[PDB]
Design a protein around this ligand. Structure first.
Ligand SMILES: [K+]
Ligand SMILES: [K+]
Ligand SMILES: [Mg+2]
Ligand SMILES: [Mg+2]
Ligand SMILES: [Mg+2]
Length: 189
RNA sequence: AGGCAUUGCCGCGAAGCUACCAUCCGCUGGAUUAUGGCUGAACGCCUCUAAGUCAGAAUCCAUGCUAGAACGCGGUGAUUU
C-alpha cells in the first residue's frame, strides 16, 4: 500500500528562522546556526505561516513514510539546539584506579585526555568536535559535561569518550569501570 | 736449477666466490569486516538501521618496493652536402 499523503508539522518558535531550499535546511536562533543536507530523502517542505513548516511525502511506501517522521525530528532537534541547546553529563566509574580526565592541546586542536584507566600506562585521547564545549562540574565528583547546539555533535562526542574506556580481556559485569552518559538534557531549563 | 708422479703429497696462502658459519636492512596512510556505538523513525514507547552516521581486524586499496606495454606516452640534443 502506497499512502496518497502523509504529513508532519514542524513548530517554529519565536526567535528562530528556518530557511529551506533544495532540501538544505538552515536554522538560525539565539544560540547560533545549524545546517543539514537532506538531499538523501524525497520529501516536500511547505510553509504554512512564520510559526509552522509542514513536511510531506506523496505516494510513499512504508519505508519512505518511516523516513518522514525522522525528518521531522532531525529538523525539530536543530531548532531545540539553537534555542535550548543540548547538554550531556557523564560520570566516571571506578573501583580502584581514579580515572583522570583533562583537556589538552595538540597543535591548537583540543583533546579529552584520559589517564590511569584501570591503571593503564596508555594515554587515551578523544578529539573535541567543533562546536562542543567541555566542562568539569565542581558540585558533583567525577563528572564531565559536554554541551553544544548540535545534538549529533554533542552525543557522538560523548560516545567517543564512553567507548575509548572499554575494558578488554576482563569480565565487564565485574569490571564496571568507564565514563558513562548519566543525563541527556538541555542547557536552558 | 729443474722434469715426471693424469693438480705427486703436506703447511701456510692473497684475490675471487661464499655462510644464520659472517654482517647490514626489511615503509605508513586510507577504506572496510566481525563487533560495539550515535542520532532515529517504523510502532506517540523502544530500538546501532529503515534514511543518515562514528569507531573498528593479521582484511582490502594505496604509499613504498620489482618489471615497464618489445604495436602506451612525454621532454630534450645532434641530424651527413
Ligand atoms: K709437481
Ligand atoms: K535512541
Ligand atoms: Mg580472563
Ligand atoms: Mg543504513
Ligand atoms: Mg618500453
Amino acid at each position: 500500500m502506497k499512502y496518497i499523503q502523509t504529513e508532519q508539522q514542524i513548530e517554529v518558535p519565536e526567535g528562530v528562522t528556518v530557511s529551506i531550499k533544495s532540501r538544505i535546511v538552515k536554522v538560525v536562533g539565539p544560540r547560533g546556526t545549524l545546517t543539514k543536507n537532506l538531499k538523501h530523502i524525497d520529501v516536500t517542505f511547505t510553509k504554512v505561516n512564520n510559526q509552522l513548516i509542514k513536511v510531506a511525502v506523496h505516494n510513499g511506501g512504508r519505508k519512505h513514510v518511516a523516513a518522514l517522521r525522522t525528518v521531522k525530528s532531525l529538523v525539530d532537534n536543530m531548532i531545540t539546539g539553537v534555542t535550548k541547546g543540548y547538554k550531556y553529563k557523564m560520570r566516571y566509574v571506578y573501583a580502584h584506579f581514579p580515572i583522570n580526565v583533562n583537556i589538552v592541546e595538540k597543535d591548537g586542536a583540543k583533546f579529552i585526555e584520559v589517564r590511569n584507566f584501570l591503571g593503564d600506562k596508555k594515554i587515551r585521547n578523544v578529539p573535541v568536535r567543533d562546536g562542543v564545549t567541555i566542562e568539569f562540574s565542581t558540585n558533583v565528583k567525577d563528572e564531565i559535561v559536554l554541551s553544544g547546539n548540535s545534538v549529533e555533535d554533542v552525543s557522538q562526542n560523548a560516545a567517543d569518550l564512553q567507548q575509548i574506556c572499554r575494558v578488554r580481556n576482563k569480565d565487564i559485569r565485574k569490571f564496571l569501570d568507564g565514563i558513562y552518559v548519566s543525563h541527556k538534557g538541555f542547557i536552558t531549563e
